[PDB]
Design a protein around this ligand. Structure first.
Ligand SMILES: *[C@@H]1O[C@H](CO)[C@@H](O[C@@H]2O[C@H](CO)[C@@H](O[C@@H]3O[C@H](CO)[C@@H](O)[C@H](O[C@H]4O[C@H](CO)[C@@H](O)[C@H](O)[C@@H]4O)[C@@H]3O)[C@H](O)[C@H]2NC(C)=O)[C@H](O)[C@H]1NC(C)=O
Ligand SMILES: *[C@@H]1O[C@H](CO)[C@@H](O[C@@H]2O[C@H](CO)[C@@H](O[C@@H]3O[C@H](CO)[C@@H](O)[C@H](O[C@H]4O[C@H](CO)[C@@H](O)[C@H](O)[C@@H]4O)[C@@H]3O)[C@H](O)[C@H]2NC(C)=O)[C@H](O)[C@H]1NC(C)=O
Ligand SMILES: *[C@@H]1O[C@H](CO)[C@@H](O[C@@H]2O[C@H](CO)[C@@H](O)[C@H](O)[C@H]2NC(C)=O)[C@H](O)[C@H]1NC(C)=O
Ligand SMILES: *[C@@H]1O[C@H](CO)[C@@H](O[C@@H]2O[C@H](CO)[C@@H](O)[C@H](O)[C@H]2NC(C)=O)[C@H](O)[C@H]1NC(C)=O
Ligand SMILES: *[C@@H]1O[C@H](CO)[C@@H](O[C@@H]2O[C@H](CO)[C@@H](O)[C@H](O)[C@H]2NC(C)=O)[C@H](O)[C@H]1NC(C)=O
Ligand SMILES: *[C@@H]1O[C@H](CO)[C@@H](O[C@@H]2O[C@H](CO)[C@@H](O)[C@H](O)[C@H]2NC(C)=O)[C@H](O)[C@H]1NC(C)=O
Ligand SMILES: *[C@@H]1O[C@H](CO)[C@@H](O[C@@H]2O[C@H](CO)[C@@H](O)[C@H](O)[C@H]2NC(C)=O)[C@H](O)[C@H]1NC(C)=O
Ligand SMILES: *[C@@H]1O[C@H](CO)[C@@H](O[C@@H]2O[C@H](CO)[C@@H](O)[C@H](O)[C@H]2NC(C)=O)[C@H](O)[C@H]1NC(C)=O
Ligand SMILES: *[C@@H]1O[C@H](CO)[C@@H](O)[C@H](O)[C@H]1NC(C)=O
Ligand SMILES: *[C@@H]1O[C@H](CO)[C@@H](O)[C@H](O)[C@H]1NC(C)=O
Ligand SMILES: *[C@@H]1O[C@H](CO)[C@@H](O)[C@H](O)[C@H]1NC(C)=O
Ligand SMILES: *[C@@H]1O[C@H](CO)[C@@H](O)[C@H](O)[C@H]1NC(C)=O
Ligand SMILES: *[C@@H]1O[C@H](CO)[C@@H](O)[C@H](O)[C@H]1NC(C)=O
Ligand SMILES: *[C@@H]1O[C@H](CO)[C@@H](O)[C@H](O)[C@H]1NC(C)=O
Ligand SMILES: *[C@@H]1O[C@H](CO)[C@@H](O)[C@H](O)[C@H]1NC(C)=O
Ligand SMILES: *[C@@H]1O[C@H](CO)[C@@H](O)[C@H](O)[C@H]1NC(C)=O
Ligand SMILES: *[C@@H]1O[C@H](CO)[C@@H](O)[C@H](O)[C@H]1NC(C)=O
Ligand SMILES: *[C@@H]1O[C@H](CO)[C@@H](O)[C@H](O)[C@H]1NC(C)=O
Ligand SMILES: *[C@@H]1O[C@H](CO)[C@@H](O)[C@H](O)[C@H]1NC(C)=O
Ligand SMILES: *[C@@H]1O[C@H](CO)[C@@H](O)[C@H](O)[C@H]1NC(C)=O
Ligand SMILES: *[C@@H]1O[C@H](CO)[C@@H](O)[C@H](O)[C@H]1NC(C)=O
Ligand SMILES: *[C@@H]1O[C@H](CO)[C@@H](O)[C@H](O)[C@H]1NC(C)=O
Ligand SMILES: *[C@@H]1O[C@H](CO)[C@@H](O)[C@H](O)[C@H]1NC(C)=O
Ligand SMILES: *[C@@H]1O[C@H](CO)[C@@H](O)[C@H](O)[C@H]1NC(C)=O
Ligand SMILES: *[C@@H]1O[C@H](CO)[C@@H](O)[C@H](O)[C@H]1NC(C)=O
Ligand SMILES: *[C@@H]1O[C@H](CO)[C@@H](O)[C@H](O)[C@H]1NC(C)=O
Ligand SMILES: *[C@@H]1O[C@H](CO)[C@@H](O)[C@H](O)[C@H]1NC(C)=O
Ligand SMILES: *[C@@H]1O[C@H](CO)[C@@H](O)[C@H](O)[C@H]1NC(C)=O
Ligand SMILES: *[C@@H]1O[C@H](CO)[C@@H](O)[C@H](O)[C@H]1NC(C)=O
Ligand SMILES: *[C@@H]1O[C@H](CO)[C@@H](O)[C@H](O)[C@H]1NC(C)=O
Ligand SMILES: *[C@@H]1O[C@H](CO)[C@@H](O)[C@H](O)[C@H]1NC(C)=O
Ligand SMILES: *[C@@H]1O[C@H](CO)[C@@H](O)[C@H](O)[C@H]1NC(C)=O
Ligand SMILES: *[C@@H]1O[C@H](CO)[C@@H](O)[C@H](O)[C@H]1NC(C)=O
Ligand SMILES: *[C@@H]1O[C@H](CO)[C@@H](O)[C@H](O)[C@H]1NC(C)=O
Lengths: 121, 432, 121, 121, 432
């Protein structure tokens, strides 16, 4: 169908079916340094996102359903508006100020879960 | 309720390092990635994106990259320090058209030989713009002797402006604005994603933009601030104006050995007579083109305003004339015949030629351009202008230039670099 | 027993017990550039294979049993020939022309599975 | 609470609740080479630990409960001493000589498990 | 049914960058990885692999690496530009054996001093092969003055051919063919995997291959195309032939200061008498060796064919003679005494010596080899030959050479670089 970022203008629920399209595009000595720095950075950025998914318990997944409740103060909208009207670019702007709060909560709930699962073994 | 998604089609503005790609050159040779024979472009439906060509760091990067490549291509070449001597010069008076009397000087000097013990008496021709009279009225020195070291360009490495494609590193993307009649700023619909830019030729020129791209429908006027007379106006044509330039002199070249493995390329005697270099612009085409430019300027200045064109203001040769490199020689042409009108066969523009070139705005690194044997003829497209406004019922436009970033900004105006941010979260009705 | 690639001449089912042997072997400024380029490439090649296993739902595994049926047109052989007679080098040649088809199918079945698992939560 | 390595002087069971604190801190051309080498190495060290967790069946986890029994010859102590009195620095010294034995056993038990799980499908 | 496996023992041919490893050198010093004191080799049972020594890019890489290291070792050394002067030369006639009359010239010249104001008159000895008569019949110049700049090798950095091990980067492997009687192409059984190559000494020579490895059982003949007379034939011996070379002259060295921190090393007077440099090859050993070579050539040319050996064809000194570097001095020996026979004490080969050396086939970078004090004696192993066939009942073989890749191809013929491809899929009887 569409290629890289083709779904960017699509709604959030129309997009999110194309997650592999974007995931696969993330992968004279002075000239050589510039190119190596570009390559090393692409790797470091990739790994930081993977580490973060790992500590949230979402390793290996493109869609990860977590155990953290949504706070209506972050965005008081119904699923119909979020998934059928909005695009991901619009959404990212809407909740930009809550991203770090959400990330902190995701880490904490995984730590609690990981320990509960040890006690049950 | 919180669901994490990875691979989300979201991006932010970013500044990164782009690499060059391309299909004995001064610029890109082997330090350049081979291009993709089947490049992609993806139309993004329903995407509006804000662009600003005046804040586009791709321009700053290109400026830096071409200067560095240029210097690397002079680094291994012969230094001409031994040439900075007193010259004994006379005029070349043999079959000279009146227009060039005094332009060529026949200079003799004592040059070194391969052996440290011996000197040789040699002579060569120089242009008047290459030398300075000192003191003994026949004594001259090269113009750069009190300012900078001079090196000879290696006569095997060409100045042909071979096109370079810029490509983004993974995790980044280049967005292109395809909105016809985009004036360089603000939002535009019709945005597509590309792997790399189209090939851009690193053509160096002043006043007139040569061999570039054309506007899709109409002549376009673009500026950072159209009401600020301190800013330049870039004019992009929708049709080319053909310009034919030549150096009608059958020059010969001679090699003077100046050391153990080094040689200087000197201009020898000229075969045939001596004629002035010049460029021809078709008059009718120029007039139609100038017509279209005025019609568009009136959109910003008033349709009852008198628009006058005037030639350039004073300054150095590199600024007041139309400078270009063609056939391996550097021309400085007088454009006062093109910009001399109120409101809106051929036009002949006389040109001067130099051998000692100070590139860009730098001081300290001069180069000597070896002479080219035979007659040079060049044909190129004028694809746009750089104008400056002289500023209550009339406005005067004059040719401007001298800042090379303006010549790249005119090709890179459509491109923006963004960074991809694949993580995101959103509410869903599920629980782990 | 055997070291790196020692099982290369072994049959496919004799090999495939040595998967960790090979997995662990994948890990003057101009001289320095050559060495950095070699190191950066080894990392990039490694990560591309890991990303690919991830999108197929095989992250963290050396043996991953998927939900895509085998098409007999890819190779009409019984398990006895494939696992007891053939080596992996021979097999790789036999189905070289079908590798991209198989990879595309593996990605698609994971996308369907991943969504079904969201709807069930 | 505490930042990076703040728990270093804490007991093993007091620590091990801070695993994400340390995990997240692992991430002129000649000058440029020195910096690129430092960055490339940080990536290579990170990936080697991740590969090792992967082959042990612990991918994506900070706490991984395995199926290898503890040999009392490695350390004859009760859980009370190990988790309530000792620090991780002390522990690492105590069993330094058994680390490679333990790692080999962890790889072997995963290989057996991985095959048993294939036979059951 | 589809099961994915990772860590599968599969590989493909590949070309990559290998790095050097090793246990004040011209070549490998600190930019080289310390070797593994306990290297591995793994036999691969039931693996047949196709090798082709004539398409082995490890050879091209080695050629490039040694040239670049060589240049980096001359880069910081003293330039001898001030030496390119008119020399006043006479013959050295003091106690000269008849064989060397005219070989050494005693030359005086005006050299610069540390101070820019003063010059000094100095003298040194040069070989006739280092100078050119000009014009005044005593006037000479150094041979390189009309072609190239010359630098002095730093007399602290040695030319000893210290062995280098090539190692593959992770994800790649080097396969080695252990099949005895492998002729360089086609499949072979008995393949093993190694971490790195054995140490290979970067010995530079023509015609005769020195100090290399030997064949396991028999003399072997290898060529790209044995019936194409335009190709070279590499002959690998299964036994060494010992060769003893010497420069029997007790030379002295003197240091001439030529600037603020720079000095030239000149050959001073020679202690004792003047004798010709030479190499000794045991006759019986050479004859037995040549015997074995012919027996093997007959396998390709006929066992009733007359095989003749002849000396080299004309060309420059670097091609027609046996060139080698030993003891720090460059020898050019006449091998016509070795290749002069039909079909199959000591043999003395006279040698010439040069101080001005143009390495490989390059022009523009000459080096001056400082003289070595005292007497030089070298003992080395001839481990093979490079032959060219001159081509209906007889074939003539002549010494060949001049292309250094042939001297590395002879050591790297057993190695191949492959890329590991760990993913694979196969049908299994299971379902997720
Ligand atoms: C605008 O675009 C036009 C069209 O692309 C461009 O004109 C081209 O200029 C180059 C260089 O002046 C011309 O190439 C020359 O053609 C002649 C034809 O006989 C050749 O002899 C020349 O060879 C010499 O130079 C070579 C340089 O590497 C040497 O290698 C060679 O040995 C010779 O010395 C050279 O090829 C080219 O033909 C024109 N194109 C046309 C259609 O005329 C123009 O210059 C551009 N304008 C600007 C200002 O850049
Ligand atoms: C084939 O292999 C043989 C054996 O490896 C090799 O012969 C060796 O050559 C080197 C260099 O000519 C010899 O080393 C010299 O030995 C004398 C002995 O007294 C030393 O005095 C020399 O020292 C001087 O040079 C040093 C260079 O770094 C200086 O540091 C030092 O201050 C001195 O100036 C030097 O060590 C070596 O002994 C022989 N080996 C044998 C067994 O004779 C041969 O050259 C190889 N053939 C070819 C063509 O490469
Ligand atoms: C530049 O000056 C030189 C030197 O006077 C001219 O060359 C001389 O021309 C006369 C004419 O017969 C010859 O006899 C001389 O031998 C020439 N001198 C040399 C050194 O060759 C030269 O022609 C002048 N060139 C121009 C273009 O005027
Ligand atoms: C560019 O060409 C024009 C046209 O020939 C030159 O213009 C002349 O300039 C002098 C300067 O005082 C005037 O007196 C003449 O009347 C001008 N000519 C015309 C037709 O008006 C101009 O000088 C040239 N520019 C340069 C830098 O040489
Ligand atoms: C000057 O502009 C013209 C018109 O854009 C260029 O000619 C076109 O070149 C493209 C390149 O593929 C062709 O497809 C068009 O058909 C050409 N148009 C015509 C009318 O022939 C011309 O090449 C430009 N000149 C230079 C020097 O770049
Ligand atoms: C090379 O030439 C020099 C210069 O003639 C010779 O050195 C001279 O030898 C005589 C003999 O008594 C001395 O009186 C001179 O003072 C020496 N000159 C200098 C500058 O020292 C030198 O011997 C010749 N060398 C050879 C090998 O023939
Ligand atoms: C290499 O050594 C041989 C043997 O001494 C030289 O051969 C002589 O070459 C001349 C050239 O015409 C012949 O007339 C002689 O008869 C040759 N000698 C013999 C024994 O036949 C040969 O010239 C030397 N090569 C070089 C390059 O000096
Ligand atoms: C010339 O070849 C001989 C025979 O291969 C070399 O001598 C051998 O060197 C190896 C190195 O460990 C020893 O193990 C052998 O025992 C030696 N053989 C004998 C008979 O002593 C000799 O070193 C080679 N010469 C050179 C200069 O490399
Ligand atoms: C763009 O908006 C229209 C509005 O209906 C929609 O149909 C179309 O699918 C959107 N683009 C994409 C890529 O979905
Ligand atoms: C929701 O967020 C608000 C502030 O954004 C916070 O005060 C409130 O306690 C949060 N609700 C819960 C249940 O944590
Ligand atoms: C995020 O912070 C900016 C800071 O100016 C603020 O204007 C914006 O409204 C905040 N967003 C939300 C959703 O509150
Ligand atoms: C002028 O050109 C003619 C062409 O025949 C030539 O013969 C004459 O010598 C030239 N004049 C001078 C002064 O060189
Ligand atoms: C060359 O040097 C001599 C030395 O006296 C001088 O007279 C002559 O004018 C010099 N030549 C030139 C062209 O300057
Ligand atoms: C370019 O278009 C934008 C769109 O709003 C406009 O604001 C801007 O002033 C235009 N440029 C000029 C020179 O008027
Ligand atoms: C353009 O320049 C004038 C000069 O004063 C300034 O007042 C005006 O605000 C500038 N326009 C913009 C958009 O900044
Ligand atoms: C330029 O030369 C072409 C032929 O090469 C000619 O048709 C064209 O009219 C010329 N242009 C001018 C302005 O003379
Ligand atoms: C340019 O075109 C306009 C169109 O009205 C015409 O009036 C004018 O005279 C033309 N100029 C020349 C030089 O032909
Ligand atoms: C300029 O053109 C615009 C186009 O609508 C028009 O409204 C305006 O009145 C015109 N001005 C003059 C002076 O004719
Ligand atoms: C522009 O034209 C005027 C006409 O008098 C002339 O004096 C001036 O020098 C010209 N400018 C240039 C740069 O030639
Ligand atoms: C400018 O136009 C006037 C109009 O006749 C003309 O006289 C003058 O020479 C022109 N200037 C140039 C530089 O051609
Ligand atoms: C090689 O083939 C023989 C044939 O039976 C087999 O026994 C042997 O195990 C094979 N090699 C390996 C490494 O399995
Ligand atoms: C099996 O592959 C063939 C071509 O290789 C294809 O036509 C066929 O439809 C495939 N079978 C299924 C069930 O998809
Ligand atoms: C794969 O493609 C090649 C191309 O020549 C073909 O010869 C080969 O038979 C194909 N393999 C299969 C299994 O069809
Ligand atoms: C340090 O030791 C004291 C001893 O009781 C303990 O209370 C304290 O918590 C320890 N430090 C940390 C970081 O736990
Ligand atoms: C425990 O370790 C000892 C040596 O450390 C070993 O001999 C013993 O067999 C091990 N126990 C088991 C059950 O493997
Ligand atoms: C580990 O090895 C060292 C080597 O000296 C030894 O002293 C130490 O006791 C060993 N550790 C244990 C726990 O045995
Ligand atoms: C020749 O050698 C002898 C050795 O005693 C020496 O005395 C004599 O001076 C030498 N001859 C010459 C001309 O140097
Ligand atoms: C050194 O310079 C003087 C200067 O006249 C010259 O006569 C002498 O011959 C030069 N010496 C040599 C060896 O060339
Ligand atoms: C080397 O062995 C292969 C094996 O088939 C053979 O084809 C080739 O011709 C042999 N080389 C020569 C020089 O005959
Ligand atoms: C060897 O060279 C001859 C020369 O014509 C050619 O015919 C023959 O095919 C070549 N052999 C190979 C294997 O290419
Ligand atoms: C080389 O020298 C050795 C002793 O160092 C001697 O035994 C050998 O026979 C010599 N070789 C020749 C060819 O003279
Ligand atoms: C070389 O060996 C052969 C063996 O038959 C012998 O006939 C021949 O004369 C020998 N050559 C020399 C120079 O001894
Ligand atoms: C080879 O031997 C012949 C014998 O006449 C000789 O003329 C020729 O120069 C020799 N070749 C070389 C390179 O010495
Ligand atoms: C070659 O062998 C013949 C046979 O006697 C001999 O006369 C000739 O001198 C030899 N050539 C050389 C260079 O020794």
């Amino acid at each position: 169908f569409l290629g890289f970022l083709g779904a960017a203008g699509s709604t959030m629920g129309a997009a999110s079916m194309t997650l592999t399209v974007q995931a696969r595009n993330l992968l004279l000595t002075v000239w050589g340094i510039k190119q190596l720095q570009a390559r090393v950075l692409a790797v470091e950025r990739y790994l930081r996102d993977q580490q973060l998914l790992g500590i949230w318990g979402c390793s290996g997944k493109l869609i990860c359903c977590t155990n953290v409740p949504w706070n209506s103060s972050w965005s008081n909208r119904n699923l119909s508006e979020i998934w059928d009207n909005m695009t991901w670019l619009q959404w990212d702007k809407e909740i930009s100020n809550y991203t770090q709060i959400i990330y902190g909560l995701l880490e904490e709930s995984q730590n609690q879960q990981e320990k509960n699962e040890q006690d049950l073994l | 309720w919180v669901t994490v998604y990875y691979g989300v089609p979201v991006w932010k503005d970013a500044e990164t390092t782009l690499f060059c790609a391309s299909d004995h050159n001064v610029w890109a040779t082997h330090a350049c990635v081979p291009t993709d024979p089947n490049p992609q472009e993806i139309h993004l439906e329903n995407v509006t994106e804000e662009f600003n060509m005046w804040k586009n760091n791709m321009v700053e990067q290109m400026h830096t990259d071409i200067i560095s490549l240029w210097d690397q291509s002079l680094k291994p070449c012969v230094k001409l320090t031994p040439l900075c001597v007193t010259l004994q010069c006379t005029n070349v008076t043999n079959n000279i058209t009146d227009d060039m009397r005094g332009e060529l000087k026949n200079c003799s000097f004592n040059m070194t030989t391969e052996l440290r013990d011996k000197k040789q008496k040699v002579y060569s021709l120089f242009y008047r713009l290459d030398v300075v009279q000192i003191n003994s009225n026949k004594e001259y020195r090269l113009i750069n002797c009190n300012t900078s070291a001079i090196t000879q360009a290696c006569p095997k490495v060409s100045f042909e402006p071979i096109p370079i494609h810029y490509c983004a590193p993974a995790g980044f993307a280049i967005l292109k604005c395809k909105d016809k009649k985009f004036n360089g700023t603000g939002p535009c619909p019709s945005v597509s994603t590309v792997q790399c830019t189209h090939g851009i030729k690193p053509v160096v020129s002043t006043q007139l933009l040569l061999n570039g791209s054309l506007a899709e429908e109409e002549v376009m006027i673009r500026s950072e601030n159209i009401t600020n007379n301190a800013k330049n106006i870039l004019v992009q044509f929708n049709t080319p104006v053909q310009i034919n330039c030549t150096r009608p002199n059958n020059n010969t070249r001679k090699s003077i050995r100046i050391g153990p493995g080094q040689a200087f390329y000197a201009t020898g005697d000229i075969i045939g007579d001596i004629r002035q270099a010049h460029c021809n612009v078709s008059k009718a085409t120029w007039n139609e083109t100038l017509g279209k430019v005025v019609k568009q300027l009136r959109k910003h200045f008033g349709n009852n305003t008198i628009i006058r064109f005037a030639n350039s203001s004073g300054g150095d040769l590199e600024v007041t004339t139309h400078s270009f490199n063609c056939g391996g020689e550097f021309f400085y042409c007088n454009t006062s015949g093109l910009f001399n009108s109120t409101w809106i066969d051929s036009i002949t523009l006389p040109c001067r030629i130099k051998q000692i070139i100070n590139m860009w705005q730098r001081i300290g690194q001069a180069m000597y351009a070896p002479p080219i044997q035979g007659v040079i003829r060049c044909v190129s497209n004028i694809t746009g202008l750089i104008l400056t406004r002289d500023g209550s019922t009339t406005e005067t436009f004059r040719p401007g230039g001298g800042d090379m970033r303006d010549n790249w900004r005119s090709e890179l105006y459509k491109y923006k670099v963004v960074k991809i941010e694949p993580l995101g979260v959103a509410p869903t009705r599920c629980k782990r």
